[PDB]
Amino acid sequence: EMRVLLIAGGVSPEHEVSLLSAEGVLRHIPFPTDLAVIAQDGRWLLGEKALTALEAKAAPEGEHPFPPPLSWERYDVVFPLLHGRFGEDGTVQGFLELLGKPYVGAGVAASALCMDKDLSKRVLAQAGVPVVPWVAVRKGEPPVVPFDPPFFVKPANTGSSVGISRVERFQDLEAALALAFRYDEKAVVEKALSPVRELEVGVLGNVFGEASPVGEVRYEAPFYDYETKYTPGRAELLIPAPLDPGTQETVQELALKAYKVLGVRGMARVDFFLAEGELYLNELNTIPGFTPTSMYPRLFEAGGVAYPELLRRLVELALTHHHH
Amino acid sequence: MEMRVLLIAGGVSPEHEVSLLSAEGVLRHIPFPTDLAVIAQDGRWLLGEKALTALEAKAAPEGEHPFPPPLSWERYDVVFPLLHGRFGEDGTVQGFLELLGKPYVGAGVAASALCMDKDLSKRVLAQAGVPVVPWVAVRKGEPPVVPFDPPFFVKPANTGSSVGISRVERFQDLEAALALAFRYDEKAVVEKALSPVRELEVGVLGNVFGEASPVGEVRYEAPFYDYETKYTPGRAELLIPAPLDPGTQETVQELALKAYKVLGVRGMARVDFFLAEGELYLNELNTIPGFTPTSMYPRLFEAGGVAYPELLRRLVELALTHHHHH
Ligand SMILES: Nc1ncnc2c1ncn2[C@@H]1O[C@H](COP(=O)(O)OP(=O)(O)OP(=O)(O)O)[C@@H](O)[C@H]1O
Ligand SMILES: Nc1ncnc2c1ncn2[C@@H]1O[C@H](COP(=O)(O)OP(=O)(O)OP(=O)(O)O)[C@@H](O)[C@H]1O
Ligand SMILES: [Mg+2]
Ligand SMILES: [Mg+2]
Ligand SMILES: [Mg+2]
Ligand SMILES: [Mg+2]
Numbered sequence: 181e182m183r184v185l186l187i188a189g190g191v192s193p194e195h196e197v198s199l200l201s202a203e204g205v206l207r208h209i210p211f212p213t214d215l216a217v218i219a220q221d222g223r224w225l226l227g228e229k230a231l232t233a234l235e236a237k238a239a240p241e242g243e244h245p246f247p248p249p250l251s252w253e254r255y256d257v258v259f260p261l262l263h264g265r266f267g268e269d270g271t272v273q274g275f276l277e278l279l280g281k282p283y284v285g286a287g288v289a290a291s292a293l294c295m296d297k298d299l300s301k302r303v304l305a306q307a308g309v310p311v312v313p314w315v316a317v318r319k320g321e322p323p324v325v326p327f328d329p330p331f332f333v334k335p336a337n338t339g340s341s342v343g344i345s346r347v348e349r350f351q352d353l354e355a356a357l358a359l360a361f362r363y364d365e366k367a368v369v370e371k372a373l374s375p376v377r378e379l380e381v382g383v384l385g386n387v388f389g390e391a392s393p394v395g396e397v398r399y400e401a402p403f404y405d406y407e408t409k410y411t412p413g414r415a416e417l418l419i420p421a422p423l424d425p426g427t428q429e430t431v432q433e434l435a436l437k438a439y440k441v442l443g444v445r446g447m448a449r450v451d452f453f454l455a456e457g458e459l460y461l462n463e464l465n466t467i468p469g470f471t472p473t474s475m476y477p478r479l480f481e482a483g484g485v486a487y488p489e490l491l492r493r494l495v496e497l498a499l500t501h502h503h504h
Numbered sequence: 505m506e507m508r509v510l511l512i513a514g515g516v517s518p519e520h521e522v523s524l525l526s527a528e529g530v531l532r533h534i535p536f537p538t539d540l541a542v543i544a545q546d547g548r549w550l551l552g553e554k555a556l557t558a559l560e561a562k563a564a565p566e567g568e569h570p571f572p573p574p575l576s577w578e579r580y581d582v583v584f585p586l587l588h589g590r591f592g593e594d595g596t597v598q599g600f601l602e603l604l605g606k607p608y609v610g611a612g613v614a615a616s617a618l619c620m621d622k623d624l625s626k627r628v629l630a631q632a633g634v635p636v637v638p639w640v641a642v643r644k645g646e647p648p649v650v651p652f653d654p655p656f657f658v659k660p661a662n663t664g665s666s667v668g669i670s671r672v673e674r675f676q677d678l679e680a681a682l683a684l685a686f687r688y689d690e691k692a693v694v695e696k697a698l699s700p701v702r703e704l705e706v707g708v709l710g711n712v713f714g715e716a717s718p719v720g721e722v723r724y725e726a727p728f729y730d731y732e733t734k735y736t737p738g739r740a741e742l743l744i745p746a747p748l749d750p751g752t753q754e755t756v757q758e759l760a761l762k763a764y765k766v767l768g769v770r771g772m773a774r775v776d777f778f779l780a781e782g783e784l785y786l787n788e789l790n791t792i793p794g795f796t797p798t799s800m801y802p803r804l805f806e807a808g809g810v811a812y813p814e815l816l817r818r819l820v821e822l823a824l825t826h827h828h829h830h
């Protein structure tokens with residue numbers, strides 16, 4: 181017996197992306213699954229109102245304020261598909277912990293750390309994982325960037341490249357920080373890699389995960405931005421990535437190491453940079469996208485794990501951890 | 505007084521009884537009308553008069569209302585989570601309060617989860633240049649790899665009140681200590697034991713500009729500062745200020761405020777240090793320190809000119825000034 185509750189939408193800027201991910205999950209999940217939608221105002225939509233909001237691909241306003249009058253006892257596993265702030269950062273996970281329900285994905289600590297680009301880089305750099313030079317900037321404080329431009333300026337909690345700017349001159353740093361501070365109280369300034377190759381590898385499992393084949397994203401835009409990520413045809417995924425044999429194994433080893441160190445459960449898509457033959461871990465995404473242009477399902481599809489089997493194992497991993 | 509505070513104490517962690525002792529200390533001095541909500545050891549909540557009854561018993565094995573409780577959250581301006589350990593101090597209750605939209609006392613989700621994990625907090629501190637004791641993380645069902653020699657200190661990675669902590673003298677005793685630590689967490693840490701060692705503690709108060717209390721020192725006769733020594737009245741010697749030369753005390757306060765900002769803590773924290781052979785080591789950071797009659801945090805700020813009711817009042821104000829800042 182297995183009935184899954186899928187939660188999508190959310191208040192983060194990735195609201196629309198989350199509903200697209202729900203479309204992909206509902207299409208392939210092998211269990212009976214009900215949808216609950218968190219509207220952009222924080223109020224919940226249940227039942228047919230959730231499926232109606234899914235068809236509209238956007239839910240500006242909801243019905244039930246948090247916590248929702250949801251019949252939690254009717255479900256055996258909860259699948260949070262809320263990308264970004266207040267969904268991927270441990271907040272919703274904390275609610276599901278007190279609720280006692282098994283849930284898909286990383287716990288509170290792993291979700292919060294992987295969503296903070298500054299904190300995650302601190303842990304990974306200390307563990308010996310190569311990362312791009314970076315600094316954190318708090319809103320209202322003067323930035324101090326001890327390396328030469330170009331820069332990449334990001335909200336610390338961002339997803340889908342929202343609020344990210346490529347900064348070529350010092351005079352454009354203030355405008356990029358102001359854009360980033362619209363989405364977070366803390367920003368990161370990273371040294372831009374130019375040129376750069378972008379590699380991605382999926383991980384499946386609890387703490388000790390298994391790695392998918394390594395995929396490489398190619399595009400013609402200035403960088404892998406929001407339009408390039410979710411417009412069909414803009415991004416190509418080369419799988420397996422054209423890498424020298426030792427490099428593919430190194431990417432997979434670094435991903436599983438970061439996965440274990442951070443204590444991630446369920447799943448993660450680990451992104452990498454390849455510049456001048458050197459590897460850098462970009463970030464970990466504990467709730468990767470499942471949109472028609474998303475890469476996580478395609479990484480494991482090339483690894484022999486079909487889309488329904490991938491979702492089956494995610495739900496299965498949630499119960500395995502719940503039973504210790 | 506129109507301000508109304510909701511105090512949450514108890515919890516499912518092994519520090520359940522310690523949390524109830526902290527609740528009695530906070531309720532005794534808080535200058536606002538405060539209601540108590542008790543999380544029983546089975547996870548269900550006790551409200552109203554039943555919560556005060558469990559407070560007198562100093563233990564609540566069984567509760568009445570399953571989570572989420574039928575609590576009138578709109579009646580309270582600030583929520584004070586006084587839950588030590590897992591499912592209270594590690595960001596879980598903070599995430600629930602974030603979704604409720606209520607201002608709450610203490611660190612946010614990320615800082616609470618990071619500071620409760622003794623392995624991940626040490627990584628961030630070591631990356632920032634803060635001195636820490638050499639250690640290694642050991643996960644459940646995985647053979648230990650310790651690149652240093654005993655004596656060891658084996659702890660659950662998310663423990664409080666010295667629960668599940670063992671002092672290991674011989675390498676043959678390591679498996680028994682890890683088996684004890686794995687009763688409370690899937691991850692454990694193996695730290696190099698410092699002997700002899702002096703234990704220094706300092707409280708921090710604030711959101712953006714944290715201010716440090718005077719440095720205090722804990723002395724005892726037990727093999728280590730364990731659960732019985734921490735909460736049995738008179739068993740621990742609490743020295744405030746610490747009998748150190750002023751230079752070392754200033755270095756302790758500087759490291760505490762540095763770690764407070766590095767780990768992104770908000771509201772309050774008690775920073776524990778080790779002093780061995782003239783070298784300072786940051787032990788851990790506690791975002792919800794005890795308010796037990798034998799606890800250091802309220803005493804540290806009392807010696808700093810911040811009385812017990814004034815300390816609690818500033819905690820509530822800091823919760824409001826952060827929420828307004830968004
Ligand atoms: N240091 C850097 N050097 C070069 N390019 C970068 C750098 N940082 C970011 N980029 C570009 O910006 C894009 C987005 O960066 P990042 O992966 O941090 O954003 P994100 O919002 O977390 O993405 P996702 O949608 O995968 O969550 C990257 O795919 C890359 O193309
Ligand atoms: N590396 C070490 N060297 C010497 N003594 C240690 C070491 N680690 C722990 N101890 C002893 O064990 C006690 C508890 O350690 P620790 O502070 O990690 O436990 P805790 O559960 O976090 O305590 P708290 O109640 O402050 O949360 C310390 O007060 C100290 O006396
Ligand atoms: Mg990301
Ligand atoms: Mg990315
Ligand atoms: Mg502690
Ligand atoms: Mg301590």
Ligand SMILES: [Rb+]
Pocket residue numbers: 294295296463464465466
């Ligand atoms: Rb992330």
Ligand SMILES: [Rb+]
Pocket residue numbers: 313314315
């Ligand atoms: Rb840095």
Ligand SMILES: [Rb+]
Pocket residue numbers: 619620621788789790791
């Ligand atoms: Rb702690």
Ligand SMILES: [Rb+]
Pocket residue numbers: 638639640
């Ligand atoms: Rb280490």
